[PDB]
Design a binder for this molecule. Sequence first.
Ligand SMILES: COc1ccc(NCc2ccc(F)cc2)cc1
Lengths: 412, 412
Amino acid sequence: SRRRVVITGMGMLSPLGLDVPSSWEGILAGRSGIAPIEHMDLSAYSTRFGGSVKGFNVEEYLSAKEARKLDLFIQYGLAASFQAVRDSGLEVTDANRERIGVSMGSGIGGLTNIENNCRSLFEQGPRRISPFFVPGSIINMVSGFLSIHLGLQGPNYALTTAQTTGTHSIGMAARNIAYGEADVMVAGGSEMAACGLGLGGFGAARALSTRNDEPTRASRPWDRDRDGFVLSDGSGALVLEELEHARARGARIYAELVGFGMSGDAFHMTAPPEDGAGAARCMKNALRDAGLDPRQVDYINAHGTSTPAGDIAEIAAVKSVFGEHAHALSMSSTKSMTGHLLGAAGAVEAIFSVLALRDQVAPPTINLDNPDEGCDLDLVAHEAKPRKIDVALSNSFGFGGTNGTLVFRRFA
Amino acid sequence: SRRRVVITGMGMLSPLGLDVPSSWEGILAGRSGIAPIEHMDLSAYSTRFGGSVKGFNVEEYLSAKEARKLDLFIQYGLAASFQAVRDSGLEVTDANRERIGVSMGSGIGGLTNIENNCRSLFEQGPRRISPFFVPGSIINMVSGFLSIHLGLQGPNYALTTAQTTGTHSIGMAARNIAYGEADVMVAGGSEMAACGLGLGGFGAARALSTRNDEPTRASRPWDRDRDGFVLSDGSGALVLEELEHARARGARIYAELVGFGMSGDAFHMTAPPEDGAGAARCMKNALRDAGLDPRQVDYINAHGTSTPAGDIAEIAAVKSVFGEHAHALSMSSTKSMTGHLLGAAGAVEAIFSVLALRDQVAPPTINLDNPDEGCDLDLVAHEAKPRKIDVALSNSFGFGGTNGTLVFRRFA
Ligand SMILES: COc1ccc(NCc2ccc(F)cc2)cc1
């Protein structure tokens, strides 16, 4: 019968910091992590900025020997995973290693590695492709390498649901524990898509903000002057744990994961429907899964990408689901500060939602100077809002019309 | 308590054929789909052959214009998915569309598109990158395009667990139905990694057979002269359906899916442990999930990749799990004929396991001329073996030590 799932450990690399506390301090202070990109010449590109991880030292985690084999998205996912496991206090033993698994996802995986090996193939020939190209680039190898380093023998998999990945990874990992397939899961996502192929590919779709002359103001969810998402890098990982397992070992519990929803839009390969129908179906699944009155929802960490169509679809969905209570909850987009970490977005945002519960504060939507037509909810414009938060919802939406919602609440 | 899951529809593209019955006819005849790769200069590569899909006509499924937006691996996944849904007879309605979902995965996704967009980027710069590059290449777009085309609003996701993808996709879709999150799922995988990057990437790791002179003899699982796997393309899709739902509409039921196991080796990035301890845990987990004793197993569709270490690990795993019954079951690698479809391997081999149940026949391991040291099980060398099959397993063991096992049973 379905068991309860709690969060005992969290870990992160973001554009705001090299761990959770440093990232969260930036979130509550309204700081932007967005800056012109330094790692490549982007003069031929329409977008030349994004949310980079600043000062990442892989030798805090891995030998230089091993680090050289791995795409940055794997390095970031392992860094977040190691933080989360250490934060949990969990000791892996022969008695429990079969009951601990990992579901760390990515939207794109090792794009830097692919580009670099494609350059070798075209300029030199196939004999110059790295022997480590496949195991060092493909998406499941955060789950794989973490399992090898910590001896995790439980369910070992990876989701790839584009901008929904982190949310789906956490929800499905919670189902593994709920249904008895595991007692512990490390789950979340990681992404490093900031190479020519990534900025070029999103650029070709005209999906990205082109505010190159003022990057900290580019990401402006629900602002009438928004012009697309800001591409960002990093990782979130959480340790999910069966409740009685956590209680038995005296774990610190941050919050309980009470609900998870998925739905497909079945609308369009890339565009969300303007009315938010799929996001509404997804949230209602998640609230019913959590056994909640929708009026119990205090805080929503929106997907809030700063696209014209996405941001308005989310208002329409929240109004449809919550009716008059839509005017009582607080909803914010931390992408205003972090940008869009794509497959890691739902992972860092799940962590921000849990910290909103721990600290009783709604993070701000920075840059919300002129709310667009119909964007008239409490969007926590400019400044963090201390408030009562018993229930927090984290939403994600992605290419293929794929929707995820996580529902967290305080644990006593 | 759990609902029962049955298979009511199957679809496939393989190196043996453009549908299930053509592919299966090849399998029971011991035919190879392996040949030198055409319309591609592989002079500089150590492997010049593999399993290509021959004469695929995407315009049976899509307009030319919609096909130009999608990587081959997406085309192949959609072809198998549309076949599977047709074969099921299912009518999607407003009354059931929220209960029908998709989980079609890939190990590598859009390598051909990545390669062609790299070419444009390096030669001409980012302004020649296709606008459809990202949504036409990312792994969740089979689930996405299928949901949009058929109006599916149920769980929409994609797994990427390397060579385990197709098995995990089917197993986790089965869990969705068993635990009441959906009534119908389309599940499986697709792969098209025959470009410079795929042949070059696996080749750089010296993971591929280099038997260029005799491509049909390259894939020789458990044979003492095997020298690595053969890279193959295609797709498999199954319609999974809650039993009472299948019976109420008079569906043709092929078989029941009674068990799913997952484990992690936690051993090595690309090699299994010599004793297959992870594969043994995974099969034991799958049989426990099915409430079956190892002695009830009749037929195993092996992972059987034709790698030195992989093939011997599976023999050790089977001897460990099945003890005095290990010689009584039949175990065959259809990869002897199809080669290794990576993320689609588990999907086409689940279909072959179901068909082994329908037709009471163990498919051959072709090329098993000189069984290696300790390869003394019934490996169905050279020719198909009619036999009693009530319970069939299908195993997948991939990079990162990620394992999957499906248990299928005759339905009456
Ligand atoms: C935007 O284009 C894409 C980028 C990545 C992927 N898949 C993951 C992946 C494939 C091959 C690798 F070597 C490493 C990762 C597909 C499409």
